[PDB]
Amino acid sequence: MNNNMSLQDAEWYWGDISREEVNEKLRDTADGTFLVRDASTKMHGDYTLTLRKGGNNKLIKIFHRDGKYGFSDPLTFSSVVELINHYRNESLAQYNPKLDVKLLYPVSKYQQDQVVKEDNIEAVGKKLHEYNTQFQEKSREYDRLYEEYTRTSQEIQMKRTAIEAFNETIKIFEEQCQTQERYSKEYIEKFKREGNEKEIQRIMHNYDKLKSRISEIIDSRRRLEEDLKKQAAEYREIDKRMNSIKPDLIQLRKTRDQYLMWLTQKGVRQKKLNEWL
């Protein structure tokens, strides 16, 4: 039944669509995945075959002359449908060994029909409105989540260099403890000779003043440590939530897109579409 089908009716024939449109369809797909579009009007050739091989898109021009179609002279095929079906059942190695692959998986223009089986325009347009609404909602939810995500990441960064600033501070006040003790062991030891304990209540009142300030600084950077650990937790919690929203987002966009496709076929006025979108 295949070879007599009109090219228009072919599932893998997408008419005049962009290479960019083709690219999105083929993005991250298994080898053998393919479709046909019209060639650029400004170039020689009629149709462009695009298939996946080795994680890359391969574009193969299809030419016409005097009833015959093909990739290169001589043109041996009676129609484009005949060409495709041939390479569905045979490797393109025959055309070129440097790509040994069959056309296994046609990207179908009827795919959405498989998804949306409701045959009523207004009803399909109704679901599209709901699907679009749910998707726009999830999108904004994700947006506010990313906003907090960045703000949190930034405030975590500030706290961290502040922690280092505290450490460096603490290191100095320790060095000052070291300095005073370094120099004291002579004077004090010589000044408990000559019976001066009054020279202590000044020297010692200062040592404990220094030690007190140290404790306060350590206490303050202990605080910042807990604050940071807390906010770092919020960060990872925000990340989790966003990672939950992401899959739902993509699926919602893809379902919306299919319902757009189904309604774009059957030729719904752009105006009617935009009420639903």
Place this chain on the structure above:
Amino acid sequence: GELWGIHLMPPRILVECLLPNGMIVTLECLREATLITIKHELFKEARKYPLHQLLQDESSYIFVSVTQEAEREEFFDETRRLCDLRLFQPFLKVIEPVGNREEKILNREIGFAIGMPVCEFDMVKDPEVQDFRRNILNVCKEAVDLRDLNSPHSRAMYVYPPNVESSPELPKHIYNKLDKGQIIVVIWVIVSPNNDKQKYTLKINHDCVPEQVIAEAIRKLLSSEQLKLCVLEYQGKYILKVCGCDEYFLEKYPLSQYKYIRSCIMLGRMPNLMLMAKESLYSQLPMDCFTMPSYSGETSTKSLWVINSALRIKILCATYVNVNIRDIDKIYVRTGIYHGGEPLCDNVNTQRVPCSNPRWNEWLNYDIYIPDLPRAARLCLSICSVKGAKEEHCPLAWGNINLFDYTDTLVSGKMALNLWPVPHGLEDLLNPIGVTGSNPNKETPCLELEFDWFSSVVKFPDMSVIEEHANWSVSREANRLARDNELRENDKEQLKAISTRDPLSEITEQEKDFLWSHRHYCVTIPEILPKLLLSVKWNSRDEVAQMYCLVKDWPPIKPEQAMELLDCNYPDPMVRGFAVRCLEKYLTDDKLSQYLIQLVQVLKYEQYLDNLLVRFLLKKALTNQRIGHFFFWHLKSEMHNKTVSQRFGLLLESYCRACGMYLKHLNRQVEAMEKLINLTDILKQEKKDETQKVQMKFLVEQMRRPDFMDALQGFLSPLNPAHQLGNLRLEECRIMSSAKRPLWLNWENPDIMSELLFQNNEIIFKNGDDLRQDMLTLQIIRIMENIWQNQGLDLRMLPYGCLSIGDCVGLIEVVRNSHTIMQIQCKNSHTLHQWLKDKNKGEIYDAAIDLFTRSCAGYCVATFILGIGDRHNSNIMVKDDGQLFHIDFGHFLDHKKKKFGYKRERVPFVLTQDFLIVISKGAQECTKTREFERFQEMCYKAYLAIRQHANLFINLFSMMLGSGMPELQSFDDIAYIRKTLALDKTEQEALEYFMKQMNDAHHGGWTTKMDWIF
């Protein structure tokens, strides 16, 4: 703020002081106080406390503390306001300073410019970093020598580069504005200390060199036969300087080649040039001094081509991912071997495992012979999540790794990689465009991998080995073959046609095979090189080797073509090297200034720290201060970005070390910008719910502080370093109505001739909105206007100044005498026409309508092409003279295309009856006039003009793909302009497309090819 947690420090504060005797003294201090008196107020009180016998005079002791940036900073300049030290906490340690004082001062000054303490580089273990640190210096000294060679002409040409167009050749309509090829130019002088000015008006040829202009000056009742006397002896006695400007004409150029003169010509305005004594200038030059900084096995290494094995990589485990085990079923590691953005083979996944346990421990196998791995080969990975009978995949985190390091060494053994958060908007599982290397933030998902170890150091072959293999390959297959087999016209023609396709139009497999077949003939048509490079099998060393040989000898191409080769589709260093060398030879300073935004962005794509591009750019930055100025700012504006933080920081250090005196000017600018950032932070955080009136008073009393006054006055505009910002006019400074509370600022122009250019300079400071997008749009617009001018199409655009100076922080040039449409309409479709009538009434009306019409045409075309955000009456402004322009472009390339499903190209700028009437000079039926039909033709021309130059714009966009700008994360994003320019269509089909888009947008009002005289 001025202290930690503070936005502003209270007037009086206590300072713990740590004496070298081991004592500690609290002290009263004013937030205004300087360290000098603080020391003096200190040792005064130090005696009261014990051991003060051992304290020496305040002479030999210096203050040291910790900054907000966690650096231990000694303050050698003691004239600093306490509020300006940026202390972490109010303590000072007094010590006798040790080490090289002058170099420590420089280091702190560089750090302040850089936004990060320079000592952080010292710690870095990565040998590539320390190597960059060292080796880059050769460029610095190479550059400083260049400016001392021809001194002090060499010196002044660095500080005051001539601002010239790329060509002295004048477009017809520009020349025809001149009188008999001549121009009137007023020269001024200062007679005496009285400083009244005395003008010598002139009429000379537009192509006159400054000397000749200086000659005709001293002329304007004595001996003629002698008059050669002075002009020979006194010529370099003076030099020409733009009035109100820091612009000089120090070089031999036709006067019309200087941008100011060219601008004056188009604007129908009269050039005012001041006569300045050469001595007064050449001596005032710093003669700044650059000083070299302190940081100045038996295994018999294997060649890559000797290793007989298929590539394989072992994914071990990850520390964690942030995931709900409720919502996520499984995780796995996705993986790819890339050359630029194309997989060299099939991407390979690890098995799927539970989210609770990220453990794989499996060797992934790739079908690529290890000798076949190209030089620029990269490992790209991500950890992915999986979620009837169908599933969704999402990236959780990503990372890229160069398979070869900067020493051409193949990676081996166990390495750990800290991953990056996925950029907003990116749904692709892998991210090959993203930077390479591990996330510097270690509190992050860490993936462990293991590369094979081949028992030696494995190195990529040297070029002579590559050439050897190439010769072998071409011989075994079946040059000298080029001239042996003659090139048929049939093939000669196809090659020419293929060369015409735009950079983003894929080539077919037939075209690939055709191109590679004729690779030996391709050198007769060198601009085809990017297509030839795309036809190569980069996973075949046989073909890459051969390609290398052709690249080696390849004829040079135009810089704008060379720029195409600098995007992420040409990672190979031999290709990039060729591209850079083309820039070295044929790229003018003028065009480097124009394209600087993109070239800096490309640096992100570079595999390694040290490359030919950055050495070229640094050298330019260090030999031309105007270039160095924007070079600095573009780099600095992204210092917040951890992906380029280390790279840009290291580069910025190099620049700041060799740039000389300009570092002091830059620091003043940085200082000023910081305070405007802090001030607007506070307004937004603290004063958010206060009235706009209270906000202003707070601003004034905050700005009126003499420490702010010192900061916000007497510095150079980051928008234009030639523009001096003098005294603030605080009374006229305002907060705009917008949400992020932009500051409309007003400075005096301190120039003595300022009244002849502009007496005051107004700049909008904006904190909160990303200005990268608008910065780019205004660049493109300028470039478009350039295309049109040299094409004879006079369409006045207004690419006003816009510069991103930080994370969502930037400056916007205020255009004088301009009003929004809403300001004009607010009260009838004739209002606008009436408004500008009253502004230009009399016989000057027709110049104004003309100007308006041209301006509209250019923006209508420009905005349709770019797909900027919708225009409304607040988006659109008019000037007194009639010129229309746009502001606040926002998203481009139709970024609101998704979040809707509609795939159509829209028309952001639709012409209401209001606009049409103005073009119609009031006509009742405004769409049927002679003026409107002619307006259409203007658009039709401008459109086709841009289409012819499409490659330039596509290239410029491709270079930005790593920017981080949401509007272009992908080549799919750039593709929007291919659609608006209808690049896959015939030219005649493109115009029809345009007309159609207009007709649909104007509801039939655009008319069509179908006209009725009937």
